[PDB]
Scaffold this active site. Structure first.
Site, short mmCIF file in Angstrom:
data_model
loop_
_atom_site.label_atom_id
_atom_site.label_comp_id
_atom_site.label_asym_id
_atom_site.label_seq_id
_atom_site.Cartn_x
_atom_site.Cartn_y
_atom_site.Cartn_z
N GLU A 37 4.90 -5.47 -1.73
CA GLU A 37 5.61 -5.86 -2.93
C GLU A 37 5.78 -7.37 -2.87
OE1 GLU A 37 6.24 -4.18 -5.42
OE2 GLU A 37 5.24 -2.49 -4.54
N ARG A 75 -0.19 4.48 -15.51
CA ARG A 75 -1.09 3.43 -15.06
C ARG A 75 -2.47 3.99 -14.91
NH1 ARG A 75 2.22 1.06 -10.00
NH2 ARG A 75 1.72 3.21 -9.45
C1 LIG Z 1 -2.45 4.45 -5.95
C2 LIG Z 1 -1.74 5.63 -6.56
C3 LIG Z 1 -0.37 5.57 -6.81
N1 LIG Z 1 0.24 6.64 -7.35
C4 LIG Z 1 1.68 6.63 -7.66
C5 LIG Z 1 2.47 7.42 -6.66
C6 LIG Z 1 3.76 6.63 -6.78
O1 LIG Z 1 4.66 7.20 -5.86
P1 LIG Z 1 6.23 7.20 -6.10
O2 LIG Z 1 6.31 8.51 -6.81
O3 LIG Z 1 6.66 7.12 -4.68
O4 LIG Z 1 6.61 5.97 -6.86
C7 LIG Z 1 3.08 5.34 -6.46
C8 LIG Z 1 3.79 4.01 -6.32
O5 LIG Z 1 2.76 3.00 -6.30
P2 LIG Z 1 3.13 1.44 -6.14
O6 LIG Z 1 2.55 1.17 -4.76
O7 LIG Z 1 2.44 0.69 -7.24
O8 LIG Z 1 4.61 1.33 -6.18
O9 LIG Z 1 2.29 5.33 -7.63
C9 LIG Z 1 -0.49 7.81 -7.68
O10 LIG Z 1 0.13 8.79 -8.19
N2 LIG Z 1 -1.81 7.92 -7.45
C10 LIG Z 1 -2.47 6.88 -6.91
O11 LIG Z 1 -3.69 6.97 -6.71
CA LIG Z 2 2.35 -1.90 -3.74
#
Ligand SMILES: Cc1cn([C@H]2C[C@@H](OP(=O)(O)O)[C@H](COP(=O)(O)O)O2)c(=O)[nH]c1=O
Ligand SMILES: [Ca+2]
EC number: 3.1.31.1
Length: 129
Positions: A37, A75
């Site tokens: 982060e 996203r």
């Molecule tokens: C990279 C990736 C992230 N994520 C989701 C899971 C999120 O978990 P949480 O439910 O713990 O927030 C995670 C956080 O990513 P960031 O690293 O951008 O915060 O984004 C997916 O669902 N699939 C993916 O392939």
């Molecule tokens: Ca990250």
């Protein structure tokens, strides 16, 4: 797997980038990548790295895997290429990301990115220093 065109709207951080995809603004999260982060150690180096790479590219391409294309936050989930070079990989290579969030079905480039990570981890680059 095939590349689709997109245009930069905005750098966000080391592993997210706001892009113009098929006429819609979409925040993309990089498949298989976890950057710090922006307020952790090497977070600003990660943001700066991705930013420069997306900002300089003449062509930004989006490449979905065979699994889920959207995460639960809306996203896009993709490998992003900056003038034919994969941001996802380059981060691993530079020691600015760790391989993470590996779900079966969305993992085509796992070996490749773990290769990059291995070599970054060999040289004790950035987060492996
Ligand atoms: C990279 C990736 C992230 N994520 C989701 C899971 C999120 O978990 P949480 O439910 O713990 O927030 C995670 C956080 O990513 P960031 O690293 O951008 O915060 O984004 C997916 O669902 N699939 C993916 O392939
Ligand atoms: Ca990250």
């Amino acid at each position: 797997l095939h590349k689709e065109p997109a245009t930069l709207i905005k750098a966000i951080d080391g592993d997210t980038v706001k892009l113009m995809y098929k006429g819609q603004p979409m925040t993309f999260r990089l498949l298989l990548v976890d950057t710090p982060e922006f307020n952790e150690k090497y977070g600003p180096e990660a943001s700066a790295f991705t930013k420069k790479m997306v900002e300089n590219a003449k062509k930004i391409e989006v490449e979905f895997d065979k699994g889920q294309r959207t995460d639960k936050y809306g996203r896009g989930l993709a490998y992003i290429y900056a003038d034919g070079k994969m941001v996802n990989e380059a981060l691993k290579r530079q020691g600015l990301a760790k391989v993470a969030y590996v779900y079966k079905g969305n993992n085509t480039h796992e070996q490749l990115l773990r290769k990059a990570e291995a070599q970054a981890k060999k040289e004790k680059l950035n987060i492996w220093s």
